[PDB]
């Protein structure tokens, strides 16, 4: 039984690690929807969504490291997937230390006009651990 409803965590990206914005995580009837808020208002859109059957994988991946399948992935402005989405994309997470602090890190999609150069995201592990229940 999932207890969470909606929460917000700060999200970082690669330039060096830099602050990007807020990631809103919502528990829907079927699965989870994540939204990205960048700047002030500013940019506000779906980041990725996943089905009910992938909720347990998502919770384990976002608190321990692992993988989960999204039903739809958009990412941010610099990704190829932003305009039209990518279906069934697998997200692989790792726990990495950034300035003596543990983060959940994952790769996004390819950058718009770059030779398989991919975006990387980071979220504070403690922020996810305390919210995902």
Residue numbers in the entry: 38 to 52, 56 to 80, 87 to 179
Quote the original article.
The bacterium utilizes a set of proteins, termed complement regulator-acquiring surface proteins (CRASPs), to aid evasion of the human complement system by recruiting and presenting complement regulator factor H on its surface in a manner that mimics host cells. Another member of the CRASP family, ErpC (also referred to as BbCRASP-4), is an 18 kDa protein that belongs to the OspE/F-related (Erp) paralogous family of proteins and has also been demonstrated to bind factor H. Moreover, ErpC has been implicated in the scavenging of complement factor H-related proteins CFHR-1, CFHR-2 and CFHR-5, although the functional implications of this ability to bind multiple complement proteins has yet to be fully understood. ErpC is a member of the CRASP family of proteins which aid in complement evasion by B. burgdorferi by binding and presenting complement factor H on the bacterial cell surface under distinct circumstances.
The atomic resolution structure of ErpC has been solved, showing the formation of a β-­barrel, an architecture which is completely different to the pre­dominantly α-helical CspA, which is the only other member of the CRASP family for which the structure has been elucidated. Several of the loops between β-strands could not be built in one or both copies of ErpC in the unit cell owing to a lack of electron density, suggesting that these regions are conformationally labile. However, ErpC lacks the additional structural elements that are involved in these assemblies, suggesting that it does not multimerize in a similar manner, and analysis of the interfaces between the ErpC molecules in the crystal using PISA suggested that there were no biologically relevant assemblies. The observed molecular mass of 17 000 Da correlated with the expected molecular mass of ErpC (18 316 Da), confirming that the protein is monomeric under these conditions and, in conjunction with the PISA analysis, that it is likely to be monomeric on the spirochete surface. The solvent-accessible surface of ErpC exhibits large regions of negative charge, which suggests that ErpC may be acting in a similar capacity by binding factor H via interaction interfaces reserved for host-cell localization. The binding site of complement regulators on ErpC is likely to involve residues within the loops between the β-strands in a similar manner to other bacterial factor H-binding proteins. Mapping the sequence conservation between ErpC, its paralogue OspE and members of the OspE/F-related protein family, including ErpP and ErpA, across different B. burgdorferi strains reveals that variation occurs mainly within these loops. These findings suggest that ErpC, ErpP, ErpA and OspE share a common architecture and are individually tailored to binding specific complement proteins with different affinities.
